Design a protein around this ligand. Structure first.
Ligand SMILES: [Mn+2]
Ligand SMILES: [Mn+2]
Ligand SMILES: [Mn+2]
Ligand SMILES: [Mn+2]
Length: 175
DNA sequence: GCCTTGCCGGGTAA
DNA sequence: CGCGCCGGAACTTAC
DNA sequence: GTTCCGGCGCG
DNA sequence: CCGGCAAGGC
C-alpha cells in the first residue's frame, strides 16, 4: 500500500528520466537494469536513492543501488532481474492505478519531465499514449489539460495543464 | 490591455 | 554452457 | 536516456 | 525542458 505509492513515484522518474533495460552481452551474458538519471547529485543521493532502498529492502532484492557519475548526469542503477520485472510488470498495469498511484506517478513524471519554472504547467514526451492516460487522470482529479504535438523536430508531445487549475494541480499532485 | 495557451528554436539534461 | 550482478562510459537526442 | 565493454559469479 | 513570442478570447 505504501510501497505501491513509492513504487508509482519511482516508476514516474524511470519512464521519464530513465529506463528498464534487458541487455544481452558478449556472450551469452545478460543484465537487467532499473535506471534513473538526473543532473542533481543531491536529488539522486538524498531523495531518490533512499526511496529505491526502501523498495529494495521491502522486496528482498539483494542487489545494490549503484550510482555512476557521468559527465552530463548522475545515473542511479539497480542491476536486478527481480526489480526489473517488478517495474515492468507494474508498467504493464498502469491503466489500473488507483488514486494514490496515479498521483504518485504524475508527481514522478513531473519531477522528471515537467516545466519546473512552474510559470507554466507542462509535461513533455514522445509517448502520446502515456500522456493521454495522465490526461484522463488529471481530468478525473479536476485538472483541465490539453495535449498536442509540440516539437516537430523530434515528435515530442506536450501535455499542458490549464493555469486555471494551477492551484488544484500544485497542491493535489505536487504536494 | 491583459491572460492563457499554441508556436518554435537552442542546447543541456537527459 | 548459458546466464545474472558489478562498474564504467562512449554515444545520441528527447526533452 | 541507451548500449556498448570487460569484469566476476552461479549450477 | 526553457523561454520569447503572438493569436486570440475577455
Ligand atoms: Mn523522457
Ligand atoms: Mn527527461
Ligand atoms: Mn526480509
Ligand atoms: Mn528531467
Amino acid at each position: 500500500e505504501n510501497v505501491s505509492g513509492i513504487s508509482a513515484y519511482l516508476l514516474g522518474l524511470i519512464i521519464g528520466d530513465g529506463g528498464l533495460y534487458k541487455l544481452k552481452y558478449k556472450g551469452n551474458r545478460s543484465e537487467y537494469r532499473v535506471v534513473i538519471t538526473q543532473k542533481s547529485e543531491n536529488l539522486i543521493k538524498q531523495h531518490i536513492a533512499p526511496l529505491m532502498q526502501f523498495l529494495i529492502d521491502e522486496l528482498n532484492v539483494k542487489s545494490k543501488i549503484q550510482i555512476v557519475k557521468g559527465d552530463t548526469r548522475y545515473e542511479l542503477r539497480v542491476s536486478s532481474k527481480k526489480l526489473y520485472y517488478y517495474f515492468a510488470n507494474m508498467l504493464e498495469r498502469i491503466r489500473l492505478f488507483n488514486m494514490r498511484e496515479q498521483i504518485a506517478f504524475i508527481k514522478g513524471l513531473y519531477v522528471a519531465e515537467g516545466d519546473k519554472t512552474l510559470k507554466r504547467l507542462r509535461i513533455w514526451n514522445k509517448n502520446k499514449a502515456l500522456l493521454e492516460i495522465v490526461s484522463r487522470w488529471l481530468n478525473n482529479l479536476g485538472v483541465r489539460n490539453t495535449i498536442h504535438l509540440d516539437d516537430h523536430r523530434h515528435g515530442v508531445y506536450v501535455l499542458n495543464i490549464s493555469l486555471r487549475d494551477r492551484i488544484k494541480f500544485v497542491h493535489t499532485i505536487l504536494s
